[PDB]
Amino acid sequence: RQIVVGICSMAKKSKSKPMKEILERISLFKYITVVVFEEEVILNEPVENWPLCDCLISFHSKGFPLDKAVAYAKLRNPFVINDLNMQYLIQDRREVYSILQAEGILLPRYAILNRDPNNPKECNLIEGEDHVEVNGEVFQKPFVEKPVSAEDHNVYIYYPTSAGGGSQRLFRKIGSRSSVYSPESNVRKTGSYIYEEFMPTDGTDVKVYTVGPDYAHAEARKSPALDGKVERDSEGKEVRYPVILNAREKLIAWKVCLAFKQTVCGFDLLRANGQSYVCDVNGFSFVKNSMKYYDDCAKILGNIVMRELAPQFHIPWS
Numbered sequence: 001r002q003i004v005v006g007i008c009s010m011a012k013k014s015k016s017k018p019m020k021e022i023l024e025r026i027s028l029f030k031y032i033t034v035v036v037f038e039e040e041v042i043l044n045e046p047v048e049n050w051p052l053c054d055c056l057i058s059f060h061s062k063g064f065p066l067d068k069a070v071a072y073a074k075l076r077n078p079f080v081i082n083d084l085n086m087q088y089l090i091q092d093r094r095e096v097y098s099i100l101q102a103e104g105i106l107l108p109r110y111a112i113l114n115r116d117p118n119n120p121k122e123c124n125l126i127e128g129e130d131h132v133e134v135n136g137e138v139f140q141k142p143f144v145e146k147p148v149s150a151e152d153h154n155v156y157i158y159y160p161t162s163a164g165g166g167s168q169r170l171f172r173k174i175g176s177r178s179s180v181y182s183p184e185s186n187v188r189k190t191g192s193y194i195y196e197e198f199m200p201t202d203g204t205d206v207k208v209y210t211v212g213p214d215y216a217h218a219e220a221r222k223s224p225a226l227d228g229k230v231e232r233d234s235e236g237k238e239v240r241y242p243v244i245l246n247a248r249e250k251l252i253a254w255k256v257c258l259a260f261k262q263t264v265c266g267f268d269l270l271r272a273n274g275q276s277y278v279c280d281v282n283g284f285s286f287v288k289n290s291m292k293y294y295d296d297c298a299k300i301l302g303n304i305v306m307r308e309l310a311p312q313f314h315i316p317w318s
C-alpha cells in the first residue's frame with residue numbers, strides 16, 4: 001500500500017510552477033502517491049470530508065483557513081512537514097522576533113510599539129526630527145518601521161537629515177516597483193509597529209530557503225529600499241545573484257527551520273558589519289526557477305517521508 005502525501009494550500013500555491021515541478025518529482029518515489037486537496041474542498045467542505053493522507057504538507061497564504069487545516073491534522077494525525085500552529089505565530093512579527101531572540105539568532109536591535117485602538121494618543125512613542133524613542137529606547141535615523149502583521153508589507157525606512165530626510169515606503173512588488181520615496185519624515189501615527197535599527201548591506205538582501213535543517217538554498221536580490229526599481233531579466237523574472245552561505249549562516253538556517261518547525265522555510269538575511277542578521281521569517285516558500293532546487297527539494301522531502309513512515313508501512317528503506 002502507498003504512502004499518501006497530501007498537499008493542502010490555496011490553488012495559487014498548489015498550482016504554482018515550483019509546486020507542480022516538485023510534486024512531479026516527489027511522485028517518482030516508488031512508494032509515494034501525491035494527493036493535492038482542491039481549493040473548493042479546502043474552503044467549502046468540512047475537514048471530515050477532506051482526503052486522507054499519511055504525510056501532510058500544508059501552509060497558510062492569503063485566504064487560507066488555517067483553523068481548518070489545524071482541525072484536519074488533529075482529526076487525522078498525519079506526519080506534518082510544516083507545523084500548522086506555528087503558522088499563526090509566523091503571521092505576527094513580534095512573535096517571529098521573540099523566537100529568534102530565544103534561539104540566540106542575531107537580529108536588528110528592536111522595540112515594539114503597541115497601540116491600543118481606543119487610545120492612539122496614549123502610546124510609548126516620542127519623536128525627534130532625527131530619532132524616535134520607543135518604550136524609552138532610542139533609534140537614530142536611519143531606522144526601519146514594520147507593521148506588526150507579517151502579512152502587511154508596508155515597511156517604511158526613515159532617512160536622517162544628513163541624507164536628505166523623508167522616507168522609503170516599501171510594498172508588495174507590483175510590476176517595476178518595490179518601493180517609493182516620500183518627503184514624509186514623521187513616523188506613522190496609527191497602528192502598531194516594530195521599530196528597528198537599519199542594518200547597512202551592500203544593497204542586496206539574502207533570501208534563504210530551507211528543506212529540512214541540513215539543506216538551504218540562498219540567493220540575493222536588490223534591496224527594495226535602495227531606489228525601488230525592480231530589476232528584471234530578458235524573460236521578466238526578477239534578477240537574482242548567486243549566494244553561498246558561510247558556516248555561521250548555515251547554522252542560522254538550521255536554527256530557523258527547527259525553531260519554527262517549518263521543514264520548508266523561507267527567511268531573509270542582512271549581511272552587515274561582518275555578520276548576518278535575520279529580519280523576516282516567512283514559513284513555507286520554494287525557490288523559483290531553479291531546476292536543481294526542484295530536484296534537491298523533492299529528493300529531501302521524499303527521503304523525509306520514507307525515513308519517517310517506511311517502518312510502519314513495512315517498506316525497505318536504508
Ligand SMILES: O=P(O)(O)CP(=O)(O)O[C@@H]1[C@@H](OP(=O)(O)O)[C@H](OP(=O)(O)CP(=O)(O)O)[C@@H](OP(=O)(O)O)[C@H](OP(=O)(O)O)[C@@H]1OP(=O)(O)O
Nearest residue numbers: 012013060061062063173207238266282284285286287288
Ligand atoms: O505571483 P505573482 O502574483 O505574480 C506576485 P510575485 O511574483 O511577487 O509572487 C510573490 C508571492 O506573491 P503572491 O503569491 O501573493 O502573488 C509571495 O507570496 P507571499 O508569501 O509574500 C503572500 P501569500 O503567501 O499570501 O500569497 C512570495 O511567494 P511564496 O513565498 O508564497 O512562494 C514571493 O516569493 P519570494 O518571497 O520572492 O520567494 C513571490 O515572489 P517571486 O515569485 O517573485 O519570488
Ligand SMILES: Nc1ncnc2c1ncn2[C@@H]1O[C@H](COP(=O)(O)OP(=O)(O)O)[C@@H](O)[C@H]1O
Nearest residue numbers: 108144153155196197198199205223224279280
Ligand atoms: N533592520 C533592517 N535594516 C535594513 N534593511 C531592512 C531591515 N529590515 C528590513 N529591511 C529591508 O526591508 C525589506 C522588507 O522587510 P522584511 O522585514 O523582509 O518585510 P516583508 O515581510 O515585507 O518581506 C527587507 O528585504 C530589507 O531589504
Ligand SMILES: [Mg+2]
Nearest residue numbers: 027028029032
Ligand atoms: Mg510514486
Ligand SMILES: [Mg+2]
Nearest residue numbers: 268279280281
Ligand atoms: Mg522579507
Ligand SMILES: [Mg+2]
Nearest residue numbers: 150280281282
Ligand atoms: Mg516577510
